[PDB]
Amino acid sequence: NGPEYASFFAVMGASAAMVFSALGAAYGTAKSGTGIAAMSVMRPEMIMKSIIPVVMAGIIAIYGLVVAVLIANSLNDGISLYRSFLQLGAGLSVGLSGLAAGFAIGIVGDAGVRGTAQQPRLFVGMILILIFAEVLGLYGLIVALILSTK
Amino acid sequence: NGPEYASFFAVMGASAAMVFSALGAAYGTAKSGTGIAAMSVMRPEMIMKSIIPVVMAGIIAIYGLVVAVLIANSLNDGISLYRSFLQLGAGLSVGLSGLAAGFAIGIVGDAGVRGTAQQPRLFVGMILILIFAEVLGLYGLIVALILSTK
Amino acid sequence: NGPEYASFFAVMGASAAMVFSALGAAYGTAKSGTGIAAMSVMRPEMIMKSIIPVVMAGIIAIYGLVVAVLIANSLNDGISLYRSFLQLGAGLSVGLSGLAAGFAIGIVGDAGVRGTAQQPRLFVGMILILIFAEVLGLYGLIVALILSTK
Amino acid sequence: NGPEYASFFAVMGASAAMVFSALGAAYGTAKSGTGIAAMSVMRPEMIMKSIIPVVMAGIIAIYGLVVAVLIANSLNDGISLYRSFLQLGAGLSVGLSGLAAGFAIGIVGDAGVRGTAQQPRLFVGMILILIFAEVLGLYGLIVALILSTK
Amino acid sequence: NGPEYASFFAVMGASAAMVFSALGAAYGTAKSGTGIAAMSVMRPEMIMKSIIPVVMAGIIAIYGLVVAVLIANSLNDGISLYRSFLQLGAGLSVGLSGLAAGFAIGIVGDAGVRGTAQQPRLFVGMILILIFAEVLGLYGLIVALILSTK
Amino acid sequence: NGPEYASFFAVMGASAAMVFSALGAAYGTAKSGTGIAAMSVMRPEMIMKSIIPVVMAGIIAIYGLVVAVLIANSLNDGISLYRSFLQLGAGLSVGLSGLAAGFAIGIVGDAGVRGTAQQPRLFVGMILILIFAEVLGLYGLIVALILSTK
Amino acid sequence: TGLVLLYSGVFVAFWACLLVVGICYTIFDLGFRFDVAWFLTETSPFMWSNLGIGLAISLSVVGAAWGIYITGSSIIGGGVKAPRIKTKNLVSIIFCEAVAIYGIIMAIVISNMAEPFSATDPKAIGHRNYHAGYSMFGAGLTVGLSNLFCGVCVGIVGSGAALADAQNPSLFVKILIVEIFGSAIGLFGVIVAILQTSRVKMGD
Amino acid sequence: NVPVSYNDSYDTRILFWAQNFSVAYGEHWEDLTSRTFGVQDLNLTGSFWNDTVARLVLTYDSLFGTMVTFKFILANSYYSVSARHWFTLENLEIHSNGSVAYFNASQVTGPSIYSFHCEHVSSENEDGNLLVPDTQPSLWQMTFRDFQIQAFNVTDKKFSYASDCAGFFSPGIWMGLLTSLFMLFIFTYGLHMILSLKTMDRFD
Amino acid sequence: TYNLAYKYNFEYPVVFNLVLWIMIGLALTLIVTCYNIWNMDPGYDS
């Protein structure tokens, strides 16, 4: 097997995959949800059609839970030091890239639902930029699924 | 063969190629995504052709996705310490220069689509500056492909 | 042959040459790219002539590339510690001097292009100052060549 | 000869002589070069008369280049620790004293060319101050030649 | 003779005698060089007489040159640890006391030539306070010659 | 006797008694030297009666130069670690308590000479506060004497 | 910035000093003196176990109280003119109060698993008591920080929903959906925290 | 004056210096540094060498009652995580007459290229003494006021560079520093908020 | 028999941490104090 301290890096790979992707999902819901609650007084009709920047920030939360369940179930007493460094680098790669994909949903989703309240022609353009900011968390997932499942 | 902690630097090249290029692709998407929603309130015709500064930010993310798959598929237990340092610098090269390229696409893609709203003649000039700020991610790719494949 | 930690200082010369010259080439493209969008709204004839301060910032990008390939092609398993330190100071000397040359290009290229919108005689004087900020990245190139080739 | 780590302090004298004199020459051409653009709107005649703070800031860059070539040609595999300490202090003496001289040229050369826009009598007085900010890099040169050529 | 690393502290006193005294001589020239420009638009006749506060700051640089030449001529391989600690305190007490003396010259020389423009009677009073801020660099000279030559 | 590194703490007491004291003498000269330049435009007769805060602050440098001579004359080869720590505390208690007396002269002497222009009655009161602000530099001297004789 | 210069002056001087020290342990072969093995094994697992219980509850009620004062200043600030807010907009307070319920539950679930032993050798203290020490640190960190982020997330949305209820009283039941998605982040930290301490047993 | 030096070949082997070798049986303390590193004629009965196992036996024939011998057991293994060769003093043993002491000696390790050196390798555990007995009511006690031993890479009959025992940090400091520098972050978060609760200028 | 080690005392981690965390606790107390007296802002037009 591995040394006695070997399970420290796989634990910090299950923590940082959920902590750093909770900060992206909390920023993407609070920064854009500030924009929802302020556009709604002037346009109370598009209040439900503009929820979708906060359900896209919630996918970043479940991108980090898929790997934090995968790591915390494959972790056992005394894994090798090679296998725990893999699951540390699989934890930082989806957490810190979900933190970037949660920032770029918060800043786009806030500005998008203000430009949609002033002009409804932006809604097809807003949900097209929001895919480009949401695949950044998917690129971190498909390389955390490569690293953890070695 | 090499030590057991040799795989620490090899998974910090698979992580830093993905987290630093997603933090560059977030700044290219978010900062230039407020520029779209600020210009589309007056010019709703130029929405679908202003996705070019956030499309070119999305290629910065898939530069780091390619290197983080090349590094993670060339991983074994007990690799040498020399090959471990190559893949650490292959993550920092495509990562921290894709972050520099994402910083520049975010600034000239935001300010470019502000001047394109005030004048339709800047659309060819803004694209040429976006090419110079997107080969910075390409220059970091060809050093990451040289270093990781030695 | 050299010790096992010796190859870390040579990959961190190949990486620091690329990511510090890209940070200089990004600041020359970002700050002098917003000078184009603020100039063109009154004088849109000099748009293509104003691509020069982002062209001269783009040569600093390849001053660091031609030694990041030069260091990464002299890398061997077990290089000496003296050979490995020469390539560290060849990366830190074209990077941090190319970062200085890109810092000076983005300041005088932004202020110069904003200056030729109201005075067209400044353009032959702005392009002369950009030569002086260009050779700061060239002086770091010819001293990174006499360090790597030793 | 000497120890194996001895060549580290001489390489960090070859690179610190370059990157700190290129940061002084960056601040010399960028801070004074942004004063040429503000002078040009009312006095477009003395554009070529105002490259003198930019020319004398490029002299600081070739002061650091001469010492950095002189240090990098005095390198051998296995120099003494005394000799490589001499060239570390020969790099700081022309780097960090060229960073001071290039900071002083960029400050008085900025206010000098904005003062000759409103009164051309300052032009014979502007150059006479800049020689006093020029010799601070020259004093750092002639202590770097003394320290390195021992 | 002394240890191998004993020459490190003597050369650091040879560099800091020139680094910190040129940083004070530059601030005395740069801060009192902007005061010449603000004086110039009112009193053009006082140009050549106001180059005195940057002449006095020019002697701060040669206070550090005659200590850095003095240390770098008495250097020898194998100096004792006691003799090199004497020359570290000889360079710290002539550089950092010339950095303070150059700070006070650049402040009373800047404000002194502002009040000389509005009133010419201050010029004999400004030249008195420039003397008292000059001897702070001369007091550091006479404690550098005590520590270095002993 | 003592170890070879014992003479380092005594030369850090000879340097810090001159560095930290000429920094307090520079602040009392610079902050009050702008008090002379702003006062004299209104009341140009008091440029010889009112330089007494500059002359009073020129003694803080002399109080530190005195201790830096008693320390640098009691330096011989092989002083004990006990006797060298006494000269370190004699160099900080006269340098950093001269930095205090240089603050309280520079703030009082600045505002005290503005209030003497508008009313000549303050000259007896302003010179009385400079008695209480200068004895902070004298109390640090007589505790540097009581440490250096041991 | 006055005080942020102190926090950035220490953070720069810490990592610039670890840059110099880091290139002086490798460079004169003293790597062997670093010993991250000796740090992780000679520090007591009761230190990591009680920085997990100490941070499960305290960092939850940091974010539970950070989310209360953000939206509680908008209840009383927005409810001066429209005092009908103070009874309908209390479920924003409850949604950041429930993130401290997840703290005190997951602080006494983790605390039931810490039990004393008597060994002192890192071979006598096996890699079950070390895994139990690290997994209690990493479960109080993923339930303390994930509720510190969830509690401010349902406070910023709750402060915006309390200022939209002041204008139109019909808008609150539709911005309540955004606080549901925000309060699901805190429940996701509890799912990971019960899976990090599922197969954990400490003691001998 | 000179260290003990065993050799089997023409080349020299294991060598051991101290400044005060002293032992105690019961409560009678007998100093032995005058019979060891100055007398130049020691009874090194079996001083083994095998490049992976080395023993240093010192026998004195004038001690507490009878002939009493001291054994220094060393080993030299290849550790896969560190990818090096680390020597370790295995145990140190004393055989008086029909009895074995079995003094355990961890923290007397180091890389095989370098030697060990410590200032107190005494017995009688107070906080961190390196020689611990196997059972705590131990009749034997020994004390080294200086200590320097090397095995497995002795070259030219002299010590190499020393892997010292002291270090910048001890394991009791690392736990006390990770606690003090953690609630210093809690304190300066709670002091930054009270440094910014500024009052008003006017009243109505 | 040569090349004896340098004789560091046994309490070296104690004296290192007593000096280090005081001399940067008395330097940060000194830097913060001299920062506040340097930027005093007395108020000076009259």
Ligand SMILES: CO/C1=C\C(C)=C\[C@@H](C)[C@@H](O)[C@H](C)C/C(C)=C/C=C/[C@H](OC)[C@@H]([C@@H](C)[C@@H](O)[C@H](C)[C@@]2(O)C[C@@H](O)[C@H](C)[C@@H](C(C)C)O2)OC1=O
């Ligand atoms: C929404 O995510 C879409 C694709 C995704 C996820 C691609 C990633 C894998 C991306 O990682 C990378 C960048 C690759 C890439 C290149 C994608 C281009 C995508 C589409 O482009 C075809 C856009 C869409 C922008 C584009 O189709 C626009 C409709 C448009 O066609 C309008 C044109 O007027 C405009 C000029 C043209 C230019 C800008 C490309 O784009 O659609 C999509 O379905």
Ligand SMILES: CO/C1=C\C(C)=C\[C@@H](C)[C@@H](O)[C@H](C)C/C(C)=C/C=C\[C@H](OC)[C@@H]([C@@H](C)[C@@H](O)[C@H](C)[C@@]2(O)C[C@@H](O)[C@H](C)[C@@H](C(C)C)O2)OC1=O
């Ligand atoms: C090739 O790049 C030029 C110089 C470069 C890069 C020099 C580097 C090698 C450098 O290492 C240094 C600076 C060499 C040096 C010191 C050149 C000095 C002046 C150049 O001349 C030779 C000017 C100068 C001809 C010209 O640019 C100005 C228009 C002017 O001729 C017009 C005059 O009104 C003006 C007052 C006069 C002053 C400024 C010298 O110069 O140009 C250049 O092209």
Ligand SMILES: CO/C1=C\C(C)=C\[C@@H](C)[C@@H](O)[C@H](C)C/C(C)=C/C=C\[C@H](OC)[C@@H]([C@@H](C)[C@@H](O)[C@H](C)[C@@]2(O)C[C@@H](O)[C@H](C)[C@@H](C(C)C)O2)OC1=O
């Ligand atoms: C630029 O070339 C001059 C000096 C240079 C380049 C010096 C350095 C390279 C370095 O080598 C030197 C050593 C710096 C230094 C130690 C200069 C000393 C004195 C000179 O002598 C006053 C003035 C002086 C001749 C003159 O420039 C001033 C104009 C003037 O002196 C003349 C009058 O206008 C005015 C009334 C007078 C005042 C204050 C009474 O100032 O240096 C020069 O000229």
Ligand SMILES: CCCCCCCC/C=C\CCCCCCCC(=O)O
């Ligand atoms: C070993 C002791 C070292 C630690 C001691 C730290 C104690 C700090 C004490 C005082 C620092 C506060 C000084 C700053 C004054 C605040 C000025 C103001 O807020 O107006």
Ligand SMILES: *[C@@H]1O[C@H](CO)[C@@H](O)[C@H](O)[C@H]1NC(C)=O
């Ligand atoms: C140690 O070496 C010497 C010199 O070769 C030899 O005479 C002696 O016999 C050796 N010691 C033993 C115990 O063989």
Ligand SMILES: *[C@@H]1O[C@H](CO)[C@@H](O)[C@H](O)[C@H]1NC(C)=O
């Ligand atoms: C230590 O050695 C000295 C002489 O070397 C001796 O007098 C003393 O008794 C020894 N210490 C003890 C505790 O025996």
Ligand SMILES: *[C@@H]1O[C@H](CO)[C@@H](O)[C@H](O)[C@H]1NC(C)=O
């Ligand atoms: C060396 O000797 C020890 C003890 O006698 C033995 O266990 C080991 O196998 C030997 N090794 C070799 C290589 O002879």
Ligand SMILES: *[C@@H]1O[C@H](CO)[C@@H](O)[C@H](O)[C@H]1NC(C)=O
């Ligand atoms: C050895 O045996 C004798 C027999 O009585 C006893 O007195 C003595 O104490 C023994 N030696 C030791 C060291 O106990």
Ligand SMILES: *[C@@H]1O[C@H](CO)[C@@H](O)[C@H](O)[C@H]1NC(C)=O
């Ligand atoms: C103590 O020594 C015995 C030798 O019989 C060994 O088996 C045991 O592992 C040692 N224990 C420790 C904690 O070193």
